[PDB]
Structures are given as C-alpha cells and as structure tokens.
C-alpha cells in the first residue's frame, strides 16, 4: 500500500495526485484532480480514495469547495460524487463504518460547527449533530468507532479543546483539552492513541506532538518533529506516522518526517516532488 497525497497549495491551489511508498522510497505521479484544491481532506473507503472540500485559490478566484471526488487506483480515474450541503475549506474528515464524516471548515467568513455524513453505497450526504464549537483547520481521527474533533480555529481563538462524537447517540462531548493550542495540526490515530502533530498556536508554527490516551483521558507529549509545520498532511502507514509538507511561517515544506512509536523518534524519510501546504492524505 502507498501514501496518496492530493491537492495542496504553492502559489495557487494544486491538482497534484502523487503516491509515496515506505519500501522503495519512490514517488509516483498519478491522475490530476479535475479541479485544483487546497485545504481539503483525504480518506479511503473500500479501496477508493476520496477528496473532500477545500477551495480553489487561483489567480482568478478563491472558491470554497463543497465537492466530493473519488479516485479508483484500479482505474486511475477521478469520479465526482454528490456534493456536501455547504462548502468546507480547511475541513476535517474521519471514516466510521464505511461512512465519511465531514467536520467544520469555512465558507467565506462562516466558520462551521456543522457536521455531515456520506454513504458511498448510496452516494448521498446528510446532516448529523453539530459540534459544540466552530472549528476550521480542525484535526479529526477515529478511535474505536468514536470520532474526535481536535483543535482548530473558531474565527478569533485558536483552540486546544477537543470533542468526541458518539455515532450510536449523535451527541458531541467535550474531552480533556490538549496541552497546546493547535490549529492546522496533523491529527491521526496510531495504536490506541489520538496524535496531534504540529499546527499553529496563533504565534508560532509548532514541532511538538502530543497523544491522547482514551483510557486515562490524558494528553502526553512525545518526541517533537524536526521542522515546525502547520497545514500538513498526515497518515498512518505500517504502524508509523508520516507527516507531509505544510507551512512553517515562510516556506512551503517538501519535508516528510516519519515517527516510530517503539523508538519515539522522527526521521526524515523523503521529500515531496515540490513543497506545498494543505494537502489531503490517505493510504490504500
């Protein structure tokens, strides 16, 4: 399996689809997105890769996206799907029981607390319960059939708060806040923890990384990344965490770092073909 990265931004929103591989360290160029997009999220359901939300920030516009598009690795074709109820730039997404959850994001000045849910078999969206908090740049992960919305930006305050969605019950509950305020962090699940890597705290991009232990309801720091970054892509591959690109306050990163939990160390694994922020990432 490979690490797919879709979209992103460098001087303008990008159409790139590229696939990386632990084993041989090779970068592969695949079919372009049909509409450029940055600030999207990526996820895999079935064996199909989905690009959700974002915006097309171009020399001729800056259009927030409600689009859902689906990539089949078997066919190398992007296929459009039904669109979300609203555009969601800087969206977060998680997958529960083959359903895609779209969390927060912005449309113009509107910072969403709304959440909606997609079913690939029926190709259609519905509104579920909204978060307690408006959040863009929100990190989202799924642990034991529960969905977590972590950090982000409400329009004025960047957030260290996190809340959890109970699908059986359609209720959001606040949990213990992170030690660090983080918007545009990379958020994933590795083993039985929710990791939050990097982000922006309103003053600095961060290299720190913390993880939430659901049993103890406690956030604890782990080893920091080499390079501070926000708006990074992140995914789990072979029980290791990869972070891809991002922005550090001046430079668009091509750096890719890899976290090994057994050794608690980050190692620079590769570089993307070009630096960019705001990608969507997933593995299949």
């Amino acid at each position: 399996r490979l690490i797919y990265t879709a979209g992103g931004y460098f001087r303008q929103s990008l159409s790139y689809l590229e696939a990386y591989n632990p084993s041989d360290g090779t970068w592969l160029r695949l079919a372009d997105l049909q509409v450029p997009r940055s600030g999207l999220a990526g996820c895999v359901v079935g064996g199909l890769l989905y690009a959700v939300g974002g915006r097309n920030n171009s020399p001729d516009g800056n259009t927030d996206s409600s689009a859902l598009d689906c990539y089949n690795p078997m066919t190398n074709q992007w296929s459009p799907c039904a669109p979300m109820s609203v555009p969601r730039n800087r969206i977060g997404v998680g997958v529960i029981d083959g359903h895609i959850y779209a969390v927060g994001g912005s449309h113009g000045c509107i910072h969403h607390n709304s959440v909606e849910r997609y079913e690939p078999e029926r190709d259609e969206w519905h509104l579920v319960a909204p978060m307690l908090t408006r959040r863009i740049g929100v990190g989202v992960a799924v642990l034991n059939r529960l969905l977590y919305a972590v950090g982000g930006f409400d329009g004025t305050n960047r957030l260290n708060s996190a809340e959890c969605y109970y699908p059986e019950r359609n209720e959001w509950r606040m949990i213990t806040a992170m030690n660090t305020i983080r918007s545009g962090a990379g958020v994933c699940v590795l083993h039985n923890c929710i990791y939050a890597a990097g982000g922006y705290d309103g003053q600095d991009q961060l290299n720190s990384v913390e993880r939430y232990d659901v049993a103890t309801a406690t956030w604890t720091f782990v080893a920091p990344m080499k390079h501070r970054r926000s708006a990074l892509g992140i995914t789990v591959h072979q029980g290791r965490i990869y972070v891809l690109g991002g922005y550090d306050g001046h430079t668009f990163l091509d750096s890719v770092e890899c976290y090994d939990p057994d050794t608690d160390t980050w190692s620079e694994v590769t570089r993307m073909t070009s630096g960019r922020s705001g990608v969507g990432v997933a593995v299949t």
């Binding site: 931004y9 929103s13 940055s38 600030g39 920030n57 800087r90 740049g137 930006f153 918007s183 545009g184 922006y200 926000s230 708006a231 922005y247 306050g249 668009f252 922020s277 705001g278």
Partner: peptide, 9 residues
C-alpha cells in the same frame, strides 16, 4: 497571507 496555511488571502 494566511499565517497558518500560507495561502494568499
């Protein structure tokens, strides 16, 4: 520029 993503505002 967006301080967090680098995108042109």
């Amino acid at each position: 520029l967006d301080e967090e993503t680098g995108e042109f505002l």
